Design a binder for this molecule. Structure first.
Ligand SMILES: [Cl-]
Ligand SMILES: [K+]
Ligand SMILES: [K+]
Ligand SMILES: [K+]
Ligand SMILES: [K+]
Ligand SMILES: [K+]
Ligand SMILES: [K+]
Ligand SMILES: [Mg+2]
Ligand SMILES: [Mg+2]
Ligand SMILES: [Mg+2]
Ligand SMILES: [Mg+2]
Ligand SMILES: [Mg+2]
Ligand SMILES: [Mg+2]
Lengths: 1015, 204, 197
């Protein structure tokens, strides 16, 4: 195929023959079909089966393919990414570009995808008007031929490219040929942290427009002071045959009712010495008491834009959903319809584990329902314009959207090398301008972003001002170059912590509370990414929410991120498993850093999602005596689909419950006085739990959906009653190697060489597979590892600290092991030191008291050397011989919870299948802990105390050593870890230590006590 | 120093300079000028071009210069001489006392312009005192105003030298030619001669 | 390729292979010569007598001209405007464009000036280093070849266009061929009230 210009190594050429960008069109020829948003016969889909062949470089593509199908081509579904069909490998790299950095050049081995399609065009399309093709997404650059003749070229993988095929087509059969380059100079602007894939991965369509046509239209809504009056202003532009008989009518609908309409001839106001736009008209519609759009109530109208002759011939109609809202920053606050937003946001990449970067309605709807069900109200398009249906769905279901240009140059050194270079201004400008031209009529878009992780360059300042000039209705933000540059209206840092400064040179991440008040600073602050949800994470999430609610100008943030970018691979038996970076032979790669989601790739929640739901609740509660005070954090809606359920229980035993309807105005308060409550005689803690339930189904939730909950301790009655004095006394038998204790059907054996309980018998069945021993380590979480790797150690990461200090290799030295026979008990006393290369890391001193009731009371007192890194946990471990079906505990749950991630968990009696006590993180680590537990039951065993625990078929060793969840194998029996104390998990980011001081185990001396009995 | 961007014959004048598809070509006319000339001390003000209306590409490039070179004001007269793309009110042929209240792009009396509600910028006419043929009537009225009003900081006469070209008659004797004299059509006749000096630098 | 791409009807292509703009350089290799602003031997003028032929459109330019002087060409002084040499007429229009307003297209009859020059360079420039050619003003757009091989393209009639000739240069005689178009999409941005040359 002929291509001497190498237009994919020239950032001056970002397209050839491509049509202007514009808002979504369908060229309806009937205005009622436009009003109803039904299908248009003038907008056809070319999605389906295409022909595809892969080549290693464009020089390998035979010229014959322009004219004739290649016999060796395959039939494949489009849209698709060709990596997902196995033609070459997807690459997971974060910052480092997947190609040598040598702009504007790309590798001579440049995988080329040759797609083609033979398709029908009806004669009627070619007798009049214009037939164009639209490719919504081609990654990363392509040439297009039609019936063998060259049509044009496009770059920018994330916006539509449209070409006029009117002169190329013939009636009946026609053949497209599209040569898609994996790498192009556009790849320098597409360095987002995601799989690197390629292909025609969004829809392909054919659109017929009349020769005289609507070529653009912009809808604005402006308001009076109290939002009770609006003016809708619609600017409409035409192309084609301009004549005095032409008119535009813009009509505005609420369902089937026309609320406003206006008609005018073309010819705009004079704007300069040469006149005005004879090819434009602005219609202004007064609207009284408009239903306003928000994420809380996504009220929409329909605007139909009719291009017609004055005497009544509709030429064509276009249309959009309109949401009446004003976005403005005033006095340092981002306001929506005059009220300060609190962004419960998440970053969402477009990712599917089977289809790659191809999006479908079902997946998009599943994501929106789950986001709203988990109290999200906002989404950031990290880091590129999305599939066009996403914005429709956010308009209609109600999410606030940050729409972001496809510009990311993270791997440059320094990061602004291209964005400060005027020679890259043309390519950057295309990415910003064509986004705003496409998406500017969607009410869900409330903020424009200039891209991501591209430093701060003068090209950003130029484009910031372009957007401010062309669209004054939306703020512009951009985080690069320190998050508070002259190119952003919103201070929008990524992974700035709540209280802790990180004073990096040039681009510090201040504490968010401190950033707001730096000398001269007045802007609102909304984190563009925070709470990095990689593996077992969201430690500290509640600290952000408390700050957002206290400080007006901290208006929230977008969690990083929604869904793990794991991909499905198949093992030898054909069984699927979740793969991450490096699993396709891609190298260099960034391993499991692609998985940072609140949800798994198949949209199953990680435990962190419930922590996000709870902290993002829209009702806040306080309890004073009898009175629950409920505060609404809705800005616009009354609580018109909300009941409060309350229950009081004594150590999990239900005592009383009731419901009360919630009737609270936006930002309002309601006092609910509880009935006179049970004052039970029995020992234990009374706990009050309240839940807000939506009785009625909505567009986004089922009837009975729980949107908020909270718990309080009520009265506590400490037990003072003495145990019934049993008359059995346990007996001790001694040998040099063991202390053996027997009581009735029960036996305990303590090894005198090791100083541990090595076996227990019930009836006469052995209960232990491995002895009960102290444990001070955990299988490291992604946040404990950060960026450290065997070939590039980061000595600052927690895991490396622990390793270097010898925590994982420390051996118990026995100091003391004694046995005493008491009045009614046998007492075993032990002391051990853990040492590593001459340094004593930990000392554990214990007593075990076995009484005539058969209970074993274990007291543990641990010293931890102040100069050793603080340990992951302070607990006991053993491998139980029993595998039992259920696990029943009185403590926080039901889901996994850790000390800095336990706000969403509630104290009650929980009972789950053993498998639900393991969280299948794709990269295995410590998991499944539940905290605050006072009683745990498993098979015949009960342990009581005040501890954290996990319980599963996998040892901490196996979790630590195994790279992927599908490679885990159930061990014999059940591994129980019972911790007096467990370190926080962290997650403010996943590349530097992030566990806050108050969740580190720094106390030096620790005490805990357990009773183990047979229930 | 003024970028090589003039789109005067478009209707309206900003048709290209408001069009994002023309931002790349316009951008190189501004950015490559600043990269060439930014070290000359004589350059004290950058201009974005001439008679190209006021479009969003102007505001983008105004901001680009303000970012890369804060040492020099940026001016541009298009779109009414006091737009968001200019640090200096810089009209052409605004009169001293007489308003010319054209729709959208009025040329106020320069004395009155300075004090319009909210206005604070200095005013320097980018063109005034059109010296076509027997002209410069009224020149003293400008200078008296410039001396009296601190913020009237002067202007640039239009213009230095007549754009006449030499032709030769039957005898080979030279004569000064203007528009239309080369068979060029349409042409604007003697409007190319607006100088304070004739083409050979003799003074008018 | 050059005729086929019609780069002078595309405001997306304002240059090909053009070097970055920068402040005036002379590559002085002695600091006292630079202090005193005296001539640099690494900066040579190519002003003076060139070969020139005029064509009514770029379609009319024969391919032989890339390789060989056209016998019908004249010897003319450069810099110059070819209207001042009498090859076609200068046009005086104020506001109305001198071409039909149909952006980004220009007339098919587009006067084309074919300039060429034979030159040689110092031996040491064939040995090492970067030799560029600088056109301080070409109105309105042009393609450049050296020794028959295409180098690049430029627009903007009023700033320098620079191209790297290092890989094009040969021992002995070398030849520049510069095809200058009167009209280009750059003309849409050059509607100043002045003679159009
Ligand atoms: Cl229809
Ligand atoms: K706040
Ligand atoms: K990542
Ligand atoms: K809790
Ligand atoms: K692991
Ligand atoms: K003055
Ligand atoms: K004139
Ligand atoms: Mg390119
Ligand atoms: Mg009607
Ligand atoms: Mg990045
Ligand atoms: Mg709580
Ligand atoms: Mg061009
Ligand atoms: Mg003019």
């Amino acid at each position: 195929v002929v291509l001497q210009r190498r237009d994919w190594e020239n950032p001056g050429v970002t397209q050839l023959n491509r049509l202007a960008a514009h808002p979504p069109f369908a060229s309806w020829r009937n205005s009622e079909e436009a009003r109803t948003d039904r299908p248009s016969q003038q907008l056809r889909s070319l999605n389906g089966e295409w022909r595809f062949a892969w080549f290693p470089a464009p020089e390998a593509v035979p010229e014959s393919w322009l004219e004739c199908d290649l016999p060796e081509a395959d039939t494949v579904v489009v849209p698709s990414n060709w990596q997902m069909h196995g033609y070459d490998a997807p690459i997971y790299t974060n910052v480092t570009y997947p190609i040598t950095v040598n702009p504007p050049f790309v590798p001579t081995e440049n995988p080329t995808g040759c797609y083609s399609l033979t398709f029908n065009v009806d004669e009627s399309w070619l007798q009049e008007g214009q037939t164009r093709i639209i490719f919504d997404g081609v990654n990363s650059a392509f040439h297009l031929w039609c019936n063998g003749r060259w049509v044009g070229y496009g770059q920018d993988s994330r916006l539509p490219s449209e070409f006029d095929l009117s002169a190329f087509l013939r009636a009946g059969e026609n053949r497209l040929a599209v040569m898609v380059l994996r790498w192009s100079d556009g790849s320098y602007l597409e360095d987002q942290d995601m799989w690197r894939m390629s292909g025609i991965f969004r829809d392909v369509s054919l659109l017929h427009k009349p020769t005289t046509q609507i070529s653009d239209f912009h809808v604005a809504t402006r308001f009076n002071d109290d939002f009770s009056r609006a003016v809708l202003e619609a600017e409409v532009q035409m192309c084609g045959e301009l004549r005095d008989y032409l008119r535009v009518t813009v009509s505005l609908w609420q369902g089937e009712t026309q609320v406003a309409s206006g008609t005018a001839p073309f010819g705009g106001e004079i704007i300069d010495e040469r006149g005005g736009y004879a090819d434009r008209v602005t219609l202004r519609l007064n609207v009284e008491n408009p239903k306003l759009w928000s994420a809380e109530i996504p009220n929409l109208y329909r605007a139909v834009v009719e291009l017609h002759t004055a005497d009544g011939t509709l030429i064509e109609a276009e249309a959009c959903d309109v949401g009446f809202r004003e976005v403005r920053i005033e006095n340092g606050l981002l306001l929506l319809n005059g009220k300060p937003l609190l962004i419960r946001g998440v970053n969402r990449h477009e990712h599917h584990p089977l289809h790659g970067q191809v999006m479908d309605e079902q997946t998009m709807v599943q994501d929106i329902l789950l986001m709203k069900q988990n109290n999200f109200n906002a989404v950031r398009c990290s880091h590129y314009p999305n599939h066009p249906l996403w914005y429709t769905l956010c308009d209609r279901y109600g999410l606030y959207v940050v729409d972001e240009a496809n510009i990311e140059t993270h791997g440059m050194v320094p990061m602004n090398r291209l964005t400060d270079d005027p020679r890259w201004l043309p390519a950057m400008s295309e990415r910003v301008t064509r986004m705003v031209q496409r998406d500017r009529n969607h009410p869900s878009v409330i903020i424009w972003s200039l891209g991501n992780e591209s430093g701060h360059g003068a090209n950003h300042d130029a484009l910031y001002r372009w957007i401010k000039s062309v669209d004054p209705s939306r703020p512009v933000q951009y985080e690069g170059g320190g998050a508070d540059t002259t190119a952003t209206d919103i201070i929008c840092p990524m992974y700035a912590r709540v209280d802790e400064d990180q004073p990096f040179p040039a681009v510090p991440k201040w504490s968010i509370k401190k950033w707001l008040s730096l000398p001269g600073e007045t802007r609102p602050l909304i984190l563009c990414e925070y709470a990095h949800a990689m593996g077992n994470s969201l430690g500290g999430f509640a600290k952000y929410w408390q700050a957002f609610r206290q400080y007006p100008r901290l208006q929230g943030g977008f969690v990083w991120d929604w869904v793990d970018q794991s991909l499905i691979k198949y093992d030898e038996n054909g069984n699927p498993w979740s793969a991450y970076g490096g699993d396709f032979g891609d190298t260099p790669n960034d391993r499991q850093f692609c998985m940072n989601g609140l949800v798994f790739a198949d949209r199953t929640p990680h435990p962190a999602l419930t922590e996000a739901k709870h902290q993002q609740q829209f009702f806040q509660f306080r309890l004073s005596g009898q009175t629950i005070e409920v505060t609404s954090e809705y800005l616009f809606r009354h609580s018109d689909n909300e009941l409060l359920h309350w229950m009081v229980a004594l150590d999990g035993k239900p005592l009383a419950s009731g419901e009360v309807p919630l009737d609270v105005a936006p930002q309002g308060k309601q006092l609910i006085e509880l009935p006179e409550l049970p004052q039970p005689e029995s020992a234990g803690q009374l706990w009050l739990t309240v839940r807000v339930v939506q009785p009625n189904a909505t567009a986004w939730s089922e009837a009975g959906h729980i949107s908020a909950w909270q718990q309080w301790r009520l009265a506590e009655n400490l037990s003072v009653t003495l145990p019934a004095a049993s008359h059995a006394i346990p007996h001790l038998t001694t040998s040099e190697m063991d202390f053996c204790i027997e009581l009735g059907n029960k036996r305990w054996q303590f090894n005198r060489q090791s100083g541990f309980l090595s076996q227990m018998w019930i009836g006469d069945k052995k209960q232990l597979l491995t002895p009960l021993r102290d444990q001070f380590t955990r299988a490291p979480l992604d946040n404990d590892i950060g960026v450290s790797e065997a070939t590039r150690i980061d000595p600052n990461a927690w895991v490396e600290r622990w390793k270097a200090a010898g925590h994982y290799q420390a051996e118990a030295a026995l100091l003391q092991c004694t046995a005493d026979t008491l009045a009614d008990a046998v007492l075993i006393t032990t002391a051990h030191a853990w040492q590593h290369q001459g340094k004593t890391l930990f000392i554990s001193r214990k007593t075990y008291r076995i009484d005539g009731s058969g209970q074993m009371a274990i007291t543990v007192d641990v010293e931890v050397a102040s100069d050793t890194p603080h340990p992951a946990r302070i607990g006991l471990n053993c491998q139980l011989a029993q595998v039992a079906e259920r696990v029943n505990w009185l403590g926080l749950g039901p889901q996994e919870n850790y000390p800095d991630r336990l706000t969403a968990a509630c104290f009650d009696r929980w009972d789950l299948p053993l498998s639900d006590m393991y969280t299948p993180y794709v990269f295995p680590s410590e998991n499944g802990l539940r905290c605050g537990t006072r009683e745990l039951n498993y098979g015949p065993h009960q342990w009581r105390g005040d501890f954290q625990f996990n319980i599963s078929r996998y040892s901490q060793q196996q979790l630590m050593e195994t790279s992927h969840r599908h490679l885990l194998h159930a061990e014999e029996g059940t591994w129980l870890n019972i911790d007096g104390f467990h370190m926080g998990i962290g997650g403010d980011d996943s590349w530097s230590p992030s566990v806050s001081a108050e969740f580190q185990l720094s106390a030096g001396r620790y005490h805990y006590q357990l009773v183990w009995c047979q229930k």
